[PDB]
Amino acid sequence: AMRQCAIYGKGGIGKSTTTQNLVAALAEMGKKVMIVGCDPKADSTRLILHSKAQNTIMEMAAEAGTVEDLELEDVLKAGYGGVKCVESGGPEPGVGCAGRGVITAINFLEEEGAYEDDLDFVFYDVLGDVVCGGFAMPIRENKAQEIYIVCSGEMMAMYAANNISKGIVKYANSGSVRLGGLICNSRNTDREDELIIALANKLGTQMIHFVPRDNVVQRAEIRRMTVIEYDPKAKQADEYRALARKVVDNKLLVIPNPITMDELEELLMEFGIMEVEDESIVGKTAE
C-alpha cells in the first residue's frame, strides 16, 4: 500500500503550501512521505525541511554533468516527520521541456531507488498552469495514479482543473490515472463553497476538502515551516489533518469529465463572478 499521489493546480493559489502542511498531517498521522517538487515556480519542498531553497536535480545534474554523478544522499534531504524531499527543478529557460526534466528525476529516483524503502506516499507537486506534454508526464508516464486538483473560487483555477482534466481523460482510457477530487482553497469568495461543488459534480468528482484562510498559515510560512509544526494545536491544523485522513480514506477515484466553455461560463455567471453581458459593444458615450 504505497500510494502515488500528485497535485496539480494553477499557481498563486496556495497549491504548494497546502500539499506540504497536508503532508505534515499525513506524517503526524503515522505514514511516510516523499514530496517530489515538480514546480519550477513554487517551493514544493520548503516548509518542511526549513531551507528557503533546495537544490534541484537539474541544477545538480547540472554542476556534476548527468544523473550519473548524482549521489542520492545530496538530492534527498531529510525533513520533518522523516518527510521526503527532492526538487525536480525547472527547465533551463528558453531552452528545454519540463517533461524531460521531471522524467529524469523519476528514472533517476527509481534508479537510485527511492521508491523502495517503506514509504506510504508519493506526492508529485505540480503546475496546472498549462496542461501540456511536459506536465502530463507523470500522468502519461503513469507514475502518478491518484490526482488531486487544487481548486478554487477563481475562473482560472476553474479553468485549469478542466484542462488538467481532459488531461486525465486522454489517458485514463489507457491506464490507472485517476482524480480523487478538487480542493477548494479559501479565497474569501462569496459562494466558493458551493461553487467548487458545482464543478466536482459537473466533472464527476467530489470536493475532498475546503481550506479556510487563517493568518496562522501566513504566520506559519513567514517562519519557514509547517503550520502543523507551528501549532499542531492550532485550529487550522485540524483543518489540514482532516483532508489528510480524507485522502487516505478516498475510495472515489474517477475518470473525470470535461465540461464545455459555455457551461463553465454559466456557473461563474450563476454563482455570480463572471458578470452578465449585453449586446452593447460600441460607441463609447457617442452611443
Ligand X SMILES: Nc1ncnc2c1ncn2[C@@H]1O[C@H](COP(=O)(O)OP(=O)(O)O)[C@@H](O)[C@H]1O
Q: Would you please indicate which residues are annotated as catalytic (active-site) residues? A: 10, 15, 41, 129
The answer to whether 151 is annotated as binding is: no
- Residue 171 burial by Cβ neighbours in a 10 Å radius (0-12, 13-18, 19+): middle
C-alpha span between 204 and 251 (Å, rounded): 14
Partner from ligand X, ligand SF4, Mg ion, none binding residue 98, C-beta < 5-8 Å depending on class: ligand SF4
Q: Which of 2, 62, 76, 97 binds ligand SF4 (CB under 6 A)?
A: 97
Rounded least distance, CB 113 to a second copy, Å: 29
Q: Which of 163, 162, 171 is nearest to 144 (CA)?
A: 171
The residue among 155 and 169 lying less far from Mg ion, judged by its C-beta, is 155
The residue among 145 and 186 lying less far from Mg ion, judged by its C-beta, is 186
Strand partners, 148: 7, 181
Q: Which of 84, 140, 209, 246 binds a second copy (CB under 8 A)?
A: 140
Which residue is closest to ligand X by CB? Answer: 12
- C-alpha distances out from residue 188 to 192, 211, 240, 260, 270, Å: 8, 10, 18, 26, 18
Does 180 sit near a second copy (CB under 8 A)? no
Partner from Mg ion, ligand SF4, ligand X, none binding residue 37, C-beta < 5-8 Å depending on class: none
E strand spans, the chain: 3-7, 34-37, 84-87, 121-125, 146-149, 178-185, 206-211
The answer to whether 15 is annotated as binding is: yes
User: Residues 8 to 27: which contact ligand X by CB under 6 A?
Assistant: 10-13, 15-16
Rounded least distance, CB 133 to ligand SF4, Å: 3
Amino acid at 140: R
Instruction: Decide the pairing of beta strands 3-7 and 206-211.
Output: unpaired
Binding site for Mg ion (CB under 5 A): 14-16, 42
